[PDB]
Amino acid sequence: AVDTAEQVYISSLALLKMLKHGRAGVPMEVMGLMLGEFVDDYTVRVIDVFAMPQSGTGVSVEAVDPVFQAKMLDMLKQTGRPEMVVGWYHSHPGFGCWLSGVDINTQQSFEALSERAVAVVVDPIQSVKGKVVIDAFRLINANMMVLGHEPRQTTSNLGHLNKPSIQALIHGLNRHYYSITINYRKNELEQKMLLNLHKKSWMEGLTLQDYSEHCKHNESVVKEMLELAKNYNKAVEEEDKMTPEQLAIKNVGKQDPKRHLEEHVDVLMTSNIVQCLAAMLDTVVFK
Template identity: 55%
Template structure:
């Protein structure tokens, strides 16, 4: 404002200076600065704004003031405040200081360059509440900016986002209605017309907009390109049975409809001559679906879905069958173990009675002569499996070739001797 007053006074003082052209001021406050927002910050702002719908959300932007013409926004973080166009919660300075301290530990040394908030569905402009909040930020730093994003109007390939700054009292003359906006001559940016809602709420009088650009590196571009990239496993994903039934019914309805339309087209073409076909070929299908092409697309899609469904169902059936067989085998093993624990003699005892040709048979025969049987079960079954002396004598007699009659004679003689010894002892006692 001081420069404008001095220029007017100088023109009033000298008549020669009236014909001189006024010099252009390169530092117009409405077009001199550019805000460069990184891809990471833009994604975070859009995600935070989409989550907060239908309420407004806010957060802080981190970056740096590179020079008098550029402001870079590297990262953002959300604040725990929400509100509407009429009321808004106050900013929590304790949370802000704690968050900046934690970000400093992660090598994030950038400073706060402004704040952002969302206007879900009603455009980008600053309300009276937003202007008061921006005024508090500009008291801390005069170049602080306010970014407004609309998550509902934003679509793929076009983000509805604008950056604003308040008009200071000394800048009112440069923002008068008769002063035109300085035009750009670079091929990088473009001049965007302001919305009527923003003009009604004070755009150009109470606050002005800044040019926003979105910078992206090669690595960030490759990373963003791989977010929605499909892998070979996506083709084997199965839908729920209800959605599969509805989609298959819809595809059948479309195929019948397109087949009827294609049949009608063939009948109409049969009645026309070649010249009429050439004339109507350019106009006939203009703005309409190509029934033949649409029929092929729907048929291919349904065939692919059915093939994938059958393959996945067959693989799932085989996997389930294998799991069932494994479970059955485990159950059988458990039952066998329980039976062995209950009846160890039935399951594990084995007595060797014959001399075998192998070394194992010879060793078992020698063990049987010593009075113990050979057990192939657990140690508990070995301890319990004892054989009486008579069984060992029988096995020894069979191995040595002694007949059963000799064993009876020996037992009779032993009984006679025992009776004689008893009678002698009784006589001595008498």
């Protein structure tokens, strides 16, 4: 059996393929295949994902083309390196993750060949940075549900760590499928070559930033900063009055001078000191 500690290892590339293909045709439930080496009974490490084109108009996971996966399967055999199909995916777009009654059917057609095929949902809207909405599931036997027998026989405090959603709890995530705790495989070969390359300037800070308009902007803030300092010459004067919790609710229609004031101090400071120092290095460096 299983010990509900299954520990799926994937990649740093397949998630990129999942967000790209799940995002490009995003309002339709797009799908495809998962092409990775099946490591031993607990874990699975899927190192590649290749996408399948759709069938027709309509949000569905319609069918597979074994002409296409046969030709594509042996294509990288004689181009790149051999791998092995293990799983498959689809994409609940703006939903989250579960197994629908359509999804569990083609899931059921894929567990028959290998019993440890993987059901994978990606959710490319509700993801921001630390969220991705993946939660790879797999079917449980409904025969054992009729038996009233609780499966999966926990031997490790490793699976009951993430709490399932109430929306997937509405569905048959457990009564018909289970969650798997995952992580990601990265290395210093990948960390540096994406850290050192994403947001990098060239010679930009070694400029003067529109030398006539820097000081012009330096009045274009200060001028209304005077009147905002007059609001700071206004709002302090109704203190020692009604208690400041009323000064918390009461100020939701009209602006405060306090926060808006220290905002422009930061703006005018950072707008000036940078152009100041960058102006003075070039005197030394250039002659």
